[PDB]
Amino acid sequence: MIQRTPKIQVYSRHPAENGKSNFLNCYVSGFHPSDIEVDLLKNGERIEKVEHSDLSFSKDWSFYLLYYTEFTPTEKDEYACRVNHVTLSQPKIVKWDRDM
């Protein structure tokens, strides 16, 4: 088995606007095998009620998954996506930069 580590992007569905309702997305792709823990965090605490798309895969057979949830951004709230995978010695956390 050739195990691949996930690429992680955390980003909002629409450009962020403080006070306007949006969607927070954690796009994990490129990983193998498929078992993965993915959590969206709000100021360090896991968000309940996160939905996920169904397991699918790219041409090279690596998997990709989108986790997402309703949120309404504020300036002082920091969001992050936490991902644990077999390839990872410790859970990687990518914070949400609204610039990206």
Partner: protein, 276 residues
């Protein structure tokens, strides 16, 4: 445009935690329209786009019947693959399978697919001639053996040339509203001061369907293919897609650099500068 249809299958064994997990999704281009998750309670194939909900109950009974037999087939095959590779029953393994077709503006077959992967590595694949196989190893040669003696290529070829193209053309009509409309990307150039010494220019493309798009940073009209940061194309979540391309540029030499956007939803390729 140019269109495609694919069915994706993953079977993931979990010894000691019941039967293998089976998930399958179907796509027309970059639009998901069917799904079947064996870990759902009483699983049936479900719709995932409005233009397929119209299909009658027989459509859906036939799809669910297929998904169930396929899940059964991967349960056999997962155990068979343990024999072919001299592996333990303790471990978790993954059988993937993708098949489907590509059609051109004419509606005629451009290419058919049907390939397998085991634990993330190519196993056996139907070749583009839809009549010969490529076996990745001496285990997949056992299958190429069993599949040549069954004329599986002939039967895959019958499906990929006939029904695959038939129904993709149908879906492109039932969903022409969305499947045949290209959402052009909304583009903007951002300027990010990193330090006193340099700033980063990010070329954004947002809200575009399909996912095919090319973003390129040119320096003096010359492509900075090596020194350009380019993220994998990502789903917005509402069916559209996002991407950005970025370059770290010296302050002042900014106006040398051009960003070129190519997308079938755009009449002309775009030319974007950072504009204060």
């Amino acid at each position: 445009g140019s269109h495609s249809m694919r069915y994706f299958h993953t079977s993931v064994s979990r010894p000691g935690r019941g039967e293998p997990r089976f998930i399958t999704v179907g796509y027309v281009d970059d639009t998901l329209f069917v799904r079947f998750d064996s870990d759902a309670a009483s699983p049936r194939e479900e719709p995932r786009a409005p233009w397929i909900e119209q299909e009658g109950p027989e459509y859906w009974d036939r799809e669910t019947q297929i998904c169930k037999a396929k899940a059964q087939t991967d349960r056999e095959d997962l155990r068979t693959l343990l024999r072919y590779y001299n592996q333990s029953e303790a471990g978790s393994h993954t059988l993937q399978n993708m098949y489907g077709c590509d059609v051109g503006p004419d509606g005629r077959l451009l290419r058919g697919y049907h390939q397998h992967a085991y634990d993330g590595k190519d196993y056996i694949a139907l070749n583009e001639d839809l009549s010969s196989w490529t076996a990745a190893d001496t285990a997949a040669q056992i299958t190429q053996r069993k599949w040549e003696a069954a004329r599986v290529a002939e039967q895959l070829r019958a499906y990929l040339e006939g029904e695959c193209v038939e129904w993709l053309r149908r879906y492109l009509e039932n969903g022409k509203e969305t499947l045949q409309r290209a959402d052009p990307p909304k583009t903007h150039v951002t300027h990010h001061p990193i330090s006193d010494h340099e700033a980063t220019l990010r070329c954004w493309a947002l809200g575009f369907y399909p996912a095919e798009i090319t973003l390129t940073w040119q320096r003096d009209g010359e492509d900075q293919t090596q020194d350009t940061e380019l993220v994998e194309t990502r789903p917005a979540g509402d069916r559209t897609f996002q991407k950005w391309a970025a370059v770290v540029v010296p302050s002042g030499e900014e106006q040398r650099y051009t960003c070129h956007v190519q997308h079938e939803g755009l009449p002309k390729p775009l030319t974007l500068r950072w504009e204060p």
